Amino acid sequence: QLHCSYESFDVESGVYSVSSFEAKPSGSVVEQAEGVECDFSPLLSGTPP
């Protein structure tokens, strides 16, 4: 990469900055509303029709 920045096959000696590590991704964490619950409980009591 350093050679490409100077467009040459012989870079002058020195200390040179190079691109930083991206670190790394990790598995997702999500929070959203929960438990809205379609209520089928009437099926469980009394005499069915």
Binding site: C4, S5, Y6, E7, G14, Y16, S17, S19, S20, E22
Partner: protein, 462 residues
């Protein structure tokens, strides 16, 4: 509070002294004096930084990586320009320190300077005065070690440092070229380079004489007579210490040199902070975040929004480089000024005026400061001026070819009861009459304004 008051700006009139006709003239001479101090801050460097030209622009999202290739040559120009500016800053430091070092010095010991207080001595180290400066400075904590692990989740949630924001922006703050302990040693060597000061220019020889002794030599260098100095030796040291002691109260916002230090700190901070704000600056793009525009756009549209975002981001980087180049050059010029002051205001007494403190010149000192050097100049302030009668010279009336004129002082009509002679000699710096003797005078060609003395002169006796 009441209403504000309009006021005229005062004009301090100079003390008037009459020009005078014929062979004699009024002469104004101080009858009191005090030591005092002035100070300066000379910046010598710009903080050195580099910028990752990919990370600043994007976060490694792949669409940017493909698009960025079209502009890859701009980044090389950016990196090269910054690298060269940083190289120049390092070279200037090395260049300065080469003249700072002395071939030889006195060892530094406690109690140095005798009766002088010398709070500048190291806590054997930096100095107590340098530590007062660094504590008054408001700058954020340094990186390197432990560095990054003070940025990372194992630390306080309250850090707000631009220094740990460095790991978000793709920023790198380069370390200073020199370890602070070596810098302290360079200025310790300057403290030990005092004495010799006199005895020629001092360029190779080292007189190694006590600091108090060098001060008296300097006082004779400004025309104070030796007799006065021997009488007042303790008094001089006490006045000097009062002026020196005021340096502990000198670190206030009313001290303009101190204010310049504070501004130097915030010039570096300001440059970095501008770019942090630019990370959020949409250019009319759907969002300033690349990930947002990826998640909300069909890719044919998405790429157009990315390019618009990239163009403005590159533009701020270009502007930033131009800003850095200007600052680096101004620092280099300022560093050159400091180099001359070390070789004049510090290493030797100077007669120039202008430079150094505004009170003739006597010894000056320099200490480390953020991004620069901080000078203190001891100076001499005259007081209680009186007018006296004075003559251009004296000659023998019976032998007109015998003519003399004072050296480093003036002939005055005597006003002192211990001197039977009608004329007396005093130093240029202070009022204190003395007998005229061959040591205080030199032979000169005759002139019509010289007095015709028909009575008694010891130099020449006849």
């Amino acid at each position: 509070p009441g209403e504000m008051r309009l006021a005229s700006i005062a004009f301090n009139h100079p003390i008037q002294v009459d020009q005078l006709n014929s062979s004699y003239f009024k002469l104004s001479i101080p009858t009191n004096f005090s030591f005092g101090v002035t100070q300066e801050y000379i910046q010598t460097t710009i903080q050195k930084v580099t910028v990752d030209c990919k990370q600043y622009v994007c976060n490694g999202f792949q669409k940017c990586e493909q698009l960025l290739r079209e502009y890859g040559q701009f980044c090389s120009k950016i990196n090269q320009a910054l690298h060269g500016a940083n190289l120049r800053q390092d070279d200037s430091v090395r260049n300065l320190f080469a003249s700072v070092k002395s071939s030889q010095s006195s060892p530094i010991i406690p109690g140095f300077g005798g009766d002088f207080n010398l709070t500048l001595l190291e806590p054997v180290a930096r100095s107590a005065i340098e530590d007062l400066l660094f504590d008054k400075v408001t700058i954020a904590d340094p990186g390197y070690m432990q560095g990054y692990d003070d940025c990372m989740q194992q630390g306080p949630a309250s850090a707000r440092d631009l220094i740990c924001a460095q790991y978000v922006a793709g920023y790198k703050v380069l370390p200073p070229l020199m370890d602070v302990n070596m810098e302290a040693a360079y200025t310790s060597s300057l403290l030990g380079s005092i004495a010799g000061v006199g005895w020629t220019a001092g360029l190779s020889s080292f007189a190694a004489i006590p600091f108090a002794q060098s001060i008296f030599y300097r006082l004779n260098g400004v025309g104070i007579t030796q007799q006065v100095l021997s009488e007042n030796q303790k008094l001089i040291a006490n006045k000097f210490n009062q002026a020196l002691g005021a340096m502990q109260t000198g670190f206030t916002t009313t001290n303009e040199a101190f204010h310049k230090v504070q501004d130097a700190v915030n010039n570096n901070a300001q440059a970095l902070s501008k770019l942090a704000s630019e990370l959020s600056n949409t250019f009319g793009a759907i969002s300033a975040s690349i990930g947002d525009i990826i998640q909300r756009l069909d890719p044919p549209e998405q790429d157009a929004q990315i390019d618009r975002l990239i163009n403005g981001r590159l533009t701020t980087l270009n502007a930033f480089v131009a800003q850095q180049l200007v600052r680096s050059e101004s620092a280099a010029l300022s560093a050159q000024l400091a180099k001359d002051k070390v070789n004049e205001c510090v290493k030797a007494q100077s007669k120039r005026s202008g430079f150094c403190g505004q009170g003739t010149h006597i010894v000056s000192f320099v200490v480390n400061a953020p991004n620069g050097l901080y000078f203190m100049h001891v100076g001499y302030y005259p007081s209680n001026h009186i007018e006296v009668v004075s003559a251009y010279g004296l000659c023998d009336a019976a032998n007109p070819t015998n003519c003399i004129a004072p050296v480093n002082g003036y002939f005055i009509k005597t006003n002192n009861t211990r001197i039977v002679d009608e004329w007396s000699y005093t130093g240029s710096s202070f009022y204190a009459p003395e007998p005229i003797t061959s040591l205080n005078t030199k032979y000169v060609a005759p002139q019509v304004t010289y007095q015709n003395i028909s009575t008694n002169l010891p130099p020449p006796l006849l």
